[PDB]
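Subject: Interface between my chains keeps coming out wrong

I've been trying for a while to get a sensible model of this assembly. When I model each chain on its own everything looks fine, but I need the whole thing in one frame so I can look at the contacts. Pasting all components below, labels as-is. Any help appreciated, I'm running out of ideas.
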Amino acid sequence: ILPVSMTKTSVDCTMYICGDSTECSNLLLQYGSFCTQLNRALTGIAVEQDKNTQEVFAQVKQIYKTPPIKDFGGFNFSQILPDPSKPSKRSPIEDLLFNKVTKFNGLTVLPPLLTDEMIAQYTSALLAGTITSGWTFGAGPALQIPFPMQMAYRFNGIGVTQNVLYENQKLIANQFNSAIGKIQDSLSSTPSALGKLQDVVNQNAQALNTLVKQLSSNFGAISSVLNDILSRLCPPEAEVQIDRLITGRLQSLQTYVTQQLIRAAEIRASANLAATKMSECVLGQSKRVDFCGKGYHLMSFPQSAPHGVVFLH
Amino acid sequence: QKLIANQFNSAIGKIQDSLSSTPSALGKLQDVVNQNAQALNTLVKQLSSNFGAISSVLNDILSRLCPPEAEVQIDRLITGRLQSLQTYVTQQLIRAAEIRASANLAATKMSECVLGQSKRVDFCGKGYHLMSFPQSAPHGVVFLHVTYVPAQEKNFTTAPAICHDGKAHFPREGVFVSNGTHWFVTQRNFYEPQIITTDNTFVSGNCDVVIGIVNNTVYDPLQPELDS
Amino acid sequence: QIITTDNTFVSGNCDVVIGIVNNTVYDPLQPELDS
Amino acid sequence: NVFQTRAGCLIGAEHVNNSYECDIPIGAGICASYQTSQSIIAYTMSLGAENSVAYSNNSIAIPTNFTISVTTE
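Reply #2:
Try treating it as a single job with all components included. I did that and got this:
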């Protein structure tokens, strides 16, 4: 399970720091371009989350689709392929992954560019290319090959002579089908599995809740509320009380945007790893030890999840 | 060889045409120039800000006022100009970590794509990697990744193994394929059909085990050569 | 190693290949079969 | 010329049923582009050309020729 993106927040820093007050808004202009460079930083973070998502999933140039006949030689992909029964055609494992991962003050959340139904069409195209054509759809045109003959090449790719597949094909197919069955049980019974993606949800929710709670702080002013200062005091002293709130609310946003820049760099390193696992594990057969799971790697299947990707190595 | 050499020479020619005609091509290097220029313009424009002082200009405060009040007006400028520099240095530390991650990737592409040949899919460009050439650029490196792309697919019937005289034969390298009437063994990444022989195939077990095995003769190269 | 039909594989006539050289390739069968 | 999207209310862009590569990204699968008489159009983005790979239990495709690609990173 790998993080790939995080919630695209944007903060109207004039509405966060001031909000409707023209008195505070004119004092905030004296600090120059701090508010425009906070917006510039959060916009760069937000545009990067779409790039992080595009680089992982959009590795396939064509939306490949699986045949109506499932003549895969005993291998059963039903739990990883799209389910036509569903309102959004996620797989049965992608439905578990989407079930198991779960104010007005200028703070806003922008939608991702790719909807979850577009991410699921990319995991479907990656997966349908992988099943019908092997690594060939990554390195050129998709060249069809029978799935038992693809796995016979995956066996030669680990130094196991390909007759070892054809002579054990029902055993290998049953072990694959059984191990794919255990994934649903393993995810359903292990809340700490999705915990790597749920922590992306929890950290960005906790960071916004901390940013909102910081509007209740005085920062040394007579009140935390800008309308108490503006209703009680007159400009010679009111502007001295408002500058304490501006200074603290501006430091509260500079803290948030710095934490989101550092957290975006961590999600980007994870999205670069997920994009590398997509190319080398899904579109190929990695020789790299423990890169595509613990064992001699045969192949991986991408499944989408909220803010992330899941590889079934 | 003449075809491969002409395709290589042509593909290198297209790089100059692409980089000459397309303005957005070097956009990853030009964005790194633009981000550092935007950060310095932002840092320098913040010297025109008052931060609540009587003037943005330190020589106005020091020419007009005297020490008790001058030091109050100057400390508003020190507070804001110091926060202006801490913001620049923090964003340059985060941007330097992004450039270092890109320099670590470029150093890994130098070692694995230029000094080697890479089995890693899509690491050294799309296609099966042949080789890469480093070209220097302002603040960056450009890799010209040469790759083999297979290009004219043809459909064949195929089989996992051949039944000869009870034995199941599997290809040593390559795939069994048929033109519709005759069976050949070909390498996997380029269609070059060979007659099926005890040289390009190996036995394991018999016709009973393999699902989708086909009955065809496997030629023994010794048999006619032994006495005729 | 002495060049033999075990160390080497055939593909087509001489004329396709730029810089091919004329040399004998030993067959491990024929002289041992004659002996 | 006024059009509700999951990104917000979009105004001055002509909604189009046909789908294209994403030119300007609006959000929630919507993009806009300038096209022919010219207008800014807005559309659900196309992820790529669709392809049923010609799979069966005994059909293989093998490439009879190649191209030497040079790509720039």
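Reply #3:
Confirming on my end. Chain A touches chain D through 38 residues (CB under 8 Å).
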